[model samples]
Target: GSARERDTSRRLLAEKEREMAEMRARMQQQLDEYQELLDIKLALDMEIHAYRKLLEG
Candidate 1:
């Protein structure tokens, strides 16, 4: 009975670890998408600045 209890605890620990890993992966995906959007915004800002300068000339 003791060994069976230990096995159950170990299984639960493993399941918890897997759940945490999946959550970490999802967070990383969201962070990557946010970084991509930031890069796009930066690029657009630079382009707009250049166009503004050209119009002034």
Candidate 2:
């Protein structure tokens, strides 16, 4: 009876561990995508700032 219970617990723990790993990987990917989008926005902002300066001149 003890051996059966240990085996069941081990299987459940392994399943939970795998699920958490998948969630972490997905979170990382989403963060990376957001960072890229922010970089592109910054580049556009710089270009607009330069154009405004030339127009004023």
Candidate 3:
């Protein structure tokens, strides 16, 4: 006698891989956005300092 069985393991693996890829992509995008924001924030901080120096004088 011979028997065979099939399961959703491969399908589940594929789904998990897709999820991981999507999560990584989103995280990378978020990191890039935050990096841009940080740069802007730094520029603003510098401007504020410059304004403070000029105004204080």
Candidate 4:
């Protein structure tokens, strides 16, 4: 193969790597948001359970 072809292949590989890196970052952000929401949900559930118990007693 020619040197020009090799350069093109390298450039393509770099572009693909950049895209994958961005995708990974976006997925991590989404996972973090989901975990935060889950934590809030559990906290709310606990609060509600405590209130219900108080009302029953």
Q: Which tens-of-lDDT digit does each residue in 1-57 have in candidate 3?
A: 122223466667889999999999999999999999999999999999999997899
TM-score of 3: 0.66
RMSD of each: 1.1, 1.5, 3.6, 1.6
Model 4 misplaced regions, further than 4 Å: none
TM-score of each: 0.89, 0.81, 0.66, 0.84
Residue-level lDDT of model 2, residues 1-57, one tens digit each, is: 999999999999999998999999999999999999999999999999989997779
Clashing pairs in 1: none
In candidate 3, stretches whose alpha carbon ends up further than 4 angstroms from where it belongs are 1-8, 54-57
By TM-score, the best candidate is 1
Q: How do the residues 1-57 of candidate 1 rate in per-residue lDDT, one tens digit apiece? A: 999999999999999999999999999999999999999999999999989997789
lDDT to native, each model: 0.97, 0.96, 0.88, 0.97
Which candidate do you rate higher for TM-score, 2 or 4?
A: 4
Ranking by TM-score: 1, 4, 2, 3
By lDDT, is 3 or 4 better?
4
How far off is residue 39 in model 1, in Å?
A: 0.5
